[PDB]
Amino acid sequence: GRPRTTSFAE
Amino acid sequence: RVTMNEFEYLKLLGKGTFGKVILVKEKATGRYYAMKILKKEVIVAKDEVAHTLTENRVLQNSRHPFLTALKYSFQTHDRLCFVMEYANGGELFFHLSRERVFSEDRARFYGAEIVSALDYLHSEKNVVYRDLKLENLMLDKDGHIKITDFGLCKEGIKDGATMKTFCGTPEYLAPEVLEDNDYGRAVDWWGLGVVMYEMMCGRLPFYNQDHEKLFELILMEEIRFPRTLGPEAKSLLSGLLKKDPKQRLGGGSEDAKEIMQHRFFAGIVWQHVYEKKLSPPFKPQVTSETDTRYFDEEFTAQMISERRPHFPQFDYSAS
Ligand SMILES: Nc1ncnc2c1ncn2[C@@H]1O[C@H](COP(=O)(O)OP(=O)(O)NP(=O)(O)O)[C@@H](O)[C@H]1O
Ligand SMILES: [Mn+2]
Ligand SMILES: [Mn+2]
Structure with missing residues (x-):
């Protein structure tokens, strides 16, 4: 398991 | 209505x-x-x-x-x-968290179906997905891949048309995006590289919980594979995860076709993949x-x- 990821934009 | x-x-x-x-x-x-x-x-x-x-x-x-x-x-x-x-x-992220690793066959099956979708977006719609990751990759009731979440797409991207925007998910960002110089449809193939690394190895190819140090590894660190991993998988993953997009599998004019031709995908009939003729190695219950x-x-x-x-x-x- 790794933590969930969050998408982004500058 | x-x-x-x-x-x-x-x-x-x-x-x-x-x-x-x-x-x-x-x-x-x-x-x-x-x-x-x-x-x-x-x-x-x-x-x-x-x-x-x-x-x-x-x-x-x-x-x-x-x-x-x-x-x-x-x-x-x-x-x-x-x-x-x-x-x-x-989500694929759900199943992999529970199972740690997928077999190479199972990885090939998801890989191919993601290649089929990404090929279509590139060649036929002139779109670059830009945000490929375990979370955005879902399964339907049969166990076929469904790519959802199209908020970070770019349209009007043909040949070596390039983009500037810093976006995606930090863990999955291609080196060229992190360098902050222009990039093309090749970022997707980097992304396929990362998710397929995760599927076959049970981890991200580069990880630190600090975004800056994370990006340090993505730019600098030479890729490393588990010793279990087979030659065909290792070659594909090496090719997809080339740091310079002009050396990357998928990075040329031939785009998705370069990856389809790859020996790891040997014996896959790409028309049959699109038609869903292949048996999904996992059935949702x-x-x-x-x-x-x-x-x-x-x-x-x-x-x-x-x-x-x-x-x-x-x-x-x-x-
Ligand atoms: N079509 C769908 N069918 C089933 N579950 C879905 C579907 N669309 C979204 N989800 C679930 O809802 C979650 C969030 O939706 P999503 O469209 O990925 O939003 P988002 O805000 O753009 N997230 P991100 O860009 O990853 O930070 C996904 O991770 C899935 O678990
Ligand atoms: Mn999402
Ligand atoms: Mn999104």
Whole structure:
């Protein structure tokens, strides 16, 4: 398991 | 032709930064969908209008066995709504967290179907997905790949047409994006590299919990593989994860075709992949349609002018 990821934009 | 009333809101599926995804049943027809509900208040304030508009067009203008189809998209006075094809099987991220690793055969199957979808977007729609990751990759009721979440797409991208925007998910970002110089459709193949590394190795190829140090490894560190891993897999993963996109598998003019030709994919009939003729190595075991077994339990348990402008030409219905 790794933590969930969050998408982004500058 | 479609309002908020027309659907039965049954079970929460997820909750992202900008809105919520609810499992819905259509009143008029009884079929089940997944609704992405977004408050305009947020969208306008948090400067997300552009992404919302690109996501709307991309769903509308695409039809592929491995992309979630858009049924309707409608607005209320305050909300934006995407009525989408529902993926019963949940995220790949769900299954891999539980299983640690997938077999190379299982990885090849998901890999191929993601290649088929990404090829279509590139060659036929001139889109670059830009945000490939375990979370955005879902399974349908049969166990076929469904790529959802099209908010970070770029349109009008042909040949070596390049982009500038810093976006995606930090763990999955291609070196060229991190270098902050121009990039093309090759970023997707880097992304395929990373998810397929995760599937076959059970971890990200580069990881630190600090974004800056994370990016340090992505730019500097030579790739390393588990000693179990087979030659064909290792070569593909090496090729997809070349730091310089001009050396990357998929990075040339031949795009997706370069990766399709790869010996790891030997014996895969690409037409048969598109037609879904291949047997999915994992079948989701959902009893009913409302079975949210494969969605994290944290979600699936809860009960139910200038800030709210109109969205010209937002509303959409399919054939
Ligand atoms: N069509 C669908 N069928 C089933 N589940 C879905 C569907 N669309 C979204 N979800 C779930 O809802 C979650 C959030 O939706 P998503 O469209 O990925 O939003 P987002 O805010 O753009 N997230 P991100 O860009 O990854 O930070 C996903 O991770 C899925 O678990
Ligand atoms: Mn997402
Ligand atoms: Mn998104």
